[PDB]
DNA sequence: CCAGACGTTG
DNA sequence: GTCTGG
DNA sequence: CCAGACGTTG
DNA sequence: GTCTGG
């Protein structure tokens, strides 16, 4: 739950989150901070990703069904603090322990303020720890997709995103700048799928009802939203390449299969 | 009351 | 900013 | 998440 | 062993 793909060019990227608002209006998400999309196989924590939230948390009285894509920093910074630089703090939010979250300091104060989030993925990566061997053996994993250059093109065109749970908070710089826009992953006890690969996987919201629900702070209180957060054997993956190691490797061999 | 933490993974 | 520990 | 640093003096 | 950087 520390690396991800996320490498589709913006308007590929932006057409696979093509959704449906509760009134049934087919629509794409509203980019903010397009500038800072950087499409990569090899996205760690400090990086930007893209993810859905709701309108309603940009624009007063919007319909809370309604959704913006803007790159959030991975690696939540809780608006509470104090240094200048946000890769000085101290304690990892990467990732937010499902079963702890209502008692988190960190977590709990930007979930009761209704920031939910949707982190967009290719698929996410996971590293094997194998029985007495020190090598670890590095896995994509990603949503079931449907059954040459045109044919990845086309791959690639009909790509089922991956949809994880996230809470975002909002960071002043006390120097001045730019609200810092920043996530955690939630994670979950892995699946019996990945039970063999990592005890632990993000929250993934499978389909459009989990996503809805996920980003409507308007209309789905923390409680309701919490039951959408859990394991999920829906779910495929291969073994890929040592390449996705080193996160400065950015190239289709970080997800090929090996 | 204040001081100090505020997090996850293996 | 808010909670836990002392 | 892994890879790579991990220090001071002028 | 543990932290920072990517």
């Not at 996971?126 to 990603?142: H, L």
């Amino acid at each position: 739950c520390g690396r991800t793909s996320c490498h589709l060019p913006r308007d590929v990227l932006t057409r696979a989150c093509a959704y449906q608002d509760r009134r049934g209006q087919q629509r794409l998400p509203e980019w903010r901070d397009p500038d800072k999309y950087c499409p990569s196989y090899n996205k760690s924590p400090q990086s930007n990703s893209p993810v859905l939230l709701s309108r309603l948390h940009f624009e007063k009285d919007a319909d809370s069904s309604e959704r913006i894509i803007a790159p959030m920093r991975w690696g939540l910074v809780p608006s509470w603090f104090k240094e200048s630089d946000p890769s000085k703090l101290q304690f990892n939010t990467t990732n937010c322990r499902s079963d702890t979250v209502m008692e988190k300091r960190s977590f709990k104060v930007p979930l009761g303020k209704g920031r939910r989030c949707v982190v967009l993925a290719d698929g996410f990566y996971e590293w094997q720890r194998c029985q007495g061997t020190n090598q670890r053996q590095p896995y994509f994993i990603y949503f079931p997709q449907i059954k040459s250059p045109e044919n990845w093109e086309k791959v690639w065109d009909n790509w089922r995103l991956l949809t994880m749970a996230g809470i975002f908070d909002c960071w002043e710089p006390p120097e001045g700048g730019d609200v810092l826009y920043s996530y955690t992953i939630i994670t979950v006890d892995s699946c019996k799928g990945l039970s063999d690969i990592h005890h632990r996987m993000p929250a993934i919201l499978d389909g459009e009802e989990a996503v809805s629900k996920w980003l409507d702070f308007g209309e789905v209180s923390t409680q309701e939203a919490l039951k959408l957060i859990h394991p999920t054997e829906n779910i495929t993956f291969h073994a890929v390449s040592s390449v996705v190691n080193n996160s400065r490797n950015n190239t289709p061999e970080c997800l090929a299969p090996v």
